[PDB]
Each structure stands twice: as C-alpha cells, then as structure tokens.
Design a protein around this ligand. Structure first.
Ligand SMILES: NC(=O)C1=CN([C@@H]2O[C@H](COP(=O)(O)OP(=O)(O)OC[C@H]3O[C@@H](n4cnc5c(N)ncnc54)[C@H](OP(=O)(O)O)[C@@H]3O)[C@@H](O)[C@H]2O)CCC1
Ligand SMILES: Cc1cc2nc3c(=O)[nH]c(=O)nc-3n(C[C@H](O)[C@H](O)[C@H](O)COP(=O)(O)O)c2cc1C
Length: 366
C-alpha cells in the first residue's frame, strides 16, 4: 500500500500519506475554539499523520460561516493551544488553515453589519445562498472593493495570524486561496476586474496571493507554510477563463518565492472539481500543475482508498487529503490500511452547532 510509505514534508517525517482535509464544522461557538474541537481532532490524529484544521479567521471581518474559530485574539490562541497539545500527544502534525471569506459573507457575520470586503463590488450571484446562524439561507450582499492600503493590511492580518498559530504550537499554517473566497476573488478573471496593479493582467491578479505567501513565509519560514488553490473549481462564481494557465501562473510564483527565500514551501494543496466522462481531462490538469511545481503536492477532492492509492502509485501526488470520509470515519487511516468498510456521513450535521451529534459520535472500528 503506497499510502503508508514514509514521506518527508518540510522538516516533518510522516508515517503515511492520508491527510485530514480542512473542514469547517461550525462547532467553535463565538469564534472561540471549544473542547469539542479537541475531542474531534484527537479522534482523527495518528502517529505521524498530517492534519489540517478547519478554516480559521484572520480578522473580525474574515468570517462567512457561523461559529468558525479564530486565531487573531489571545483568547483564541490559548484555546487553540490545548487542542494542539492533545493532537501532538498522539504524534501527529497539525496545520492551521488561515481563511478569509472575502465577499462570501453577510452583514450578520460582519462587525456593525458592515459590507464584506473583496477585490470588486460584484456580488455573488443569486444562484448561491449563504447559510445563516438560524439555519436558513440568505442573500450575498454587495461587497466593498478595497484599495491597496487595505490590501497590505489584510496581508498584515495573515502574517499576524501565522505568528499566533505558531504561538499556539501549530506546526505550520495553510493559506486558503481556493473555493472562491478572498484570495480566489483576486485570482479569477470572472471576479477580478480591477484597473489597478492588482487586476487586469494574469501577473497582476496573482499579486495578492504572492504577497500573502511572501508575508507568512517571512514570518514563520517557508517550511511551515502550505498553500491551497482550486483553479478548476467554480464555487461561488469563481470562474477563470483559463484555469490551467491560472494554476501554472500561481505555481510559477510559488517556485519563485522558494528560489528567492532559499527554502521550499511545505506543500501545494489543490482540490479538483471531480464531476461523467471528463475524468481524464481533470486528471491531466492536476498532473500538469504537479509536474510544474518544485515541491510537495497534495491532491484533494472526491478521493477514495483506491483512487488515493493510485494517486501515489503513478506519482500524481505525494499526499492525499480526505474530506467527508474523515467526518464519518475518525479512524479513517486505520480503515484504509486494513481495507475495512467505511461508514456513511450525515450531511445534515455538517454545519450544526452540537458538540457531539454528527461531530464526535461517529464510532471507531470494533
Ligand atoms: N471553507 C471552505 O473552503 C468550504 C469548502 N466547501 C466546498 O464548496 C462547495 C459547497 O459544498 P456544500 O456543503 O454547500 O454542498 P455540496 O458539496 O456542494 O453538494 C451538495 C449535494 O450535492 C451532492 N453531490 C453530488 N455529487 C457531488 C460531488 N461531486 N461533490 C460534492 N457533492 C456532491 C452531495 O452529496 P454528498 O452529501 O456529498 O454525498 C450533496 O447532497 C463544496 O464543493 C465544498 O467542497 C464547503 C464549504 C466550506
Ligand atoms: C462540510 C465541508 C466543510 C469544508 N470546509 C473547508 C474549509 O474550511 N477549508 C477548505 O479549504 N476546504 C473545506 N472543505 C473542502 C474539503 O476540504 C475538500 O476540498 C473536499 O471536501 C475533499 O473532497 P472529499 O470530501 O470528497 O474528500 C469543506 C468541505 C465540506 C464538505
């Protein structure tokens, strides 16, 4: 089983290649990590396994989901530390995902009901609705297009949050630049139409992610920094006219940062759209991005035991991250090793607030 051969990612020697994909679950009430998160991440931690936490706020204006944890207050750091200590006690590596939703928010998630921020003033289309704290679905409001001073301050929020994550004991951080959130709202030409230096050309639309990655690398080092993108995913109207060229342009900048900083990033994390008879074309795009990047490649999206085994066997990726199957299988790593049948997941309790129901009450193997 190639999924259980050792792999060295950064300065961390991993015992296997099954990775916990970052997953918002909305159990961190009042944006403070709760003890339920400690139990939840401990259930899934293994000796030498790599975990990525749910998306974590970098500022009071970065949230777009109810009760998502933060890492911008000292109170959040101290609560985050107890969860990291329990995960490390099992011998696992854990990264905190820094997540700014940009325009994918609502006045109920913003201080003083202010408009969310983005690269443009174009709102998300009415085909998509935002989950509200009461379980209903609302309309995405018109975002506010930030200037370059505010851009450098958001970059400052990323750098400040990365240090807070290291202060809490995290092994590193992942930059969430996918799924149509803030960083993706600058990358994709379907959204970014600015006439300044952050929009227009392909290189200009890559400036924001470059400066964010440059800031966290300068603060904590490239070996503790991962980057997640999804150029081929149109989630929340995140459509680019050339997903391959966008991904390649992003990869070339990650390489350039590695050459300049003299160290390699932790990894490149890419999620594919899946979704038919287009499996060969979607696999070619992911392999093209992998072959272009000098470093570790993590593939994500609709992966199974057999699909993940083949991903490492043919060299399409070095690590494979699992999302929904890890929700319903806390011992998913052990189940993949023994080829034991997996349990189904309940979508209704993905985003609920109960600290046990649909969160930590999925049984292990008997
Ligand atoms: N912070 C983030 O980065 C976020 C990432 N997210 C991604 O944005 C999208 C929004 O997801 P969602 O929670 O609003 O529901 P979604 O995954 O899009 O699909 C809803 C329904 O379509 C079903 N569906 C049938 N095909 C499929 C198929 N290829 N794939 C994802 N579902 C499928 C799917 O079946 P499953 O429950 O997954 O078995 C479900 O019934 C997803 O791609 C998700 O990966 C979740 C929200 C947080
Ligand atoms: C409920 C839910 C929450 C998610 N939250 C995040 C998130 O916070 N950050 C992120 O980068 N991806 C998030 N994702 C996407 C997954 O990390 C990953 O891209 C995808 O689920 C992998 O596909 P799979 O579930 O079929 O393995 C989420 C997915 C789901 C279903």
């Amino acid at each position: 089983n190639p999924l259980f051969s050792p792999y060295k990612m950064g300065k961390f020697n991993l015992s296997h290649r099954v990775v916990l994909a970052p997953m918002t679950r909305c159990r961190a009430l009042n944006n403070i990590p709760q003890a339920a998160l400690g139990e939840y991440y401990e259930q899934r931690a293994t000796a030498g396994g790599f975990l990525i936490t749910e998306g974590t706020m970098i500022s009071p204006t970065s949230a777009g989901f109810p009760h998502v944890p933060g890492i911008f207050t000292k109170e959040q750091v101290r609560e985050w530390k107890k969860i990291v200590d329990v995960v490390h006690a099992k011998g696992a590596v854990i990264f905190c995902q820094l997540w700014h939703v940009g325009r994918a928010s609502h006045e109920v998630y913003q201080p003083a009901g202010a408009a969310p921020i983005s690269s443009t003033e174009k709102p998300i289309s009415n085909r998509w609705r935002i989950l509200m704290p009461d379980g209903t679905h609302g309309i995405y409001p018109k975002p506010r297009a930030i200037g370059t001073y505010e851009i450098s301050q958001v970059v400052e929020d990323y750098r400040r949050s990365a240090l807070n994550a290291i202060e809490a004991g995290f092994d590193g951080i992942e930059i969430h630049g996918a799924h149509g959130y803030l960083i993706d709202q600058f990358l994709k030409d379907g959204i970014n139409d600015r006439t300044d230096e952050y929009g227009g050309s392909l290189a200009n639309r890559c400036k924001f992610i470059t400066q964010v990655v440059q800031a966290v690398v300068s603060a904590i080092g490239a070996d503790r920094v991962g980057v997640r993108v999804s150029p081929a995913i149109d989630h929340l109207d995140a459509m680019d006219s050339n997903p391959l060229s966008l991904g390649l342009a992003v990869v070339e900048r990650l390489n350039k940062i590695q050459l300049h900083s003299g160290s390699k990033l932790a990894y490149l994390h890419v999620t594919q759209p899946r979704s038919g008879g287009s499996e060969e074309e979607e696999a070619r795009l992911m392999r093209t991005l992998r072959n272009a990047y000098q470093g570790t490649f993590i593939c994500s999206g609709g992966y199974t035991r057999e699909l993940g085994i083949e991903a490492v066997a043919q060299g399409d990726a070095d690590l494979v991250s699992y999302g929904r199957l890890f929700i319903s299988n806390p011992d998913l790593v052990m189940r993949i090793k023994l080829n034991a049948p997996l349990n189904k997941y309940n979508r209704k309790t993905f985003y609920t607030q109960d600290p046990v129901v649909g969160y930590t009450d999925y049984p292990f193997l008997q």
